[PDB]
Amino acid sequence: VCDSGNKEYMGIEVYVEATLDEPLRQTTCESEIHKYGASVSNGGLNISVDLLNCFLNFHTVGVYTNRDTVYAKFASLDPWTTEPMNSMTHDDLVKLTEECIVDIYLKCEVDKTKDFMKTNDNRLKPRDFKTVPPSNVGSMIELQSDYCVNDVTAYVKIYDECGNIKQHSIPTLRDYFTTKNGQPRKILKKKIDNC
């Protein structure tokens, strides 16, 4: 399956962390996946991600809320057993590395008629996060925020699914965006479930 070499098999993880201007209120949770994109509605925020000239599909959408912050993860899963499969031709991979845009849009949908949520979880500690390497490429993330968001952070990693079979894998593409100033490059490590 891995060279082969007719096609490349890539995976993607997009992480979004958004802190609102007040504690989160009680909401329902909806998520959807469509062609080259996905979105999640939870905690007063709709987070949408669409991939432009990346030729990759998401397979799962996870979301976690803690106090004033929504954490989302959009990711691919096993590339050979999951549909739709994330294989691309070599020209598509060239197009990706030259033109891929991870377009992220936050839209506030806070309903102040609902009570604040009571978080049963501990405050998050440096132990709940992992550091990530710095941005690899040229501003892959294009992120639009909204008025209820005090800070937002996004991270994308696009990687070779054959990286543990091949001796020389396609180099991972990564980008990191934040409105935070003076904070480490960190992402929630706690794995988070679907709605």
From Swiss-Prot:
The gene is OPG170. This is Protein OPG170. It is found in: Secreted. The keyword Secreted applies. It comes from the Viruses. It comes from Monkeypox virus. InterPro entries: Orthopox_35kDa (IPR003184), Pox_vCCI-like_sf (IPR036540). Keywords: Early protein, Glycoprotein, Secreted, Signal. GO terms for cellular component: extracellular region. Its main location: secreted. Pfam families: Orthopox_35kD. Gene3D superfamilies: Major secreted virus protein. Glycans are attached at residue 46. Induction: Expressed in the early phase of the viral replicative cycle. May interact with several cellular chemokines to interfere with chemokine-glycosaminoglycan (GAG) interactions at the cell surface to alter chemotaxis of nearby responsive cells. Belongs to the orthopoxvirus OPG170 family.
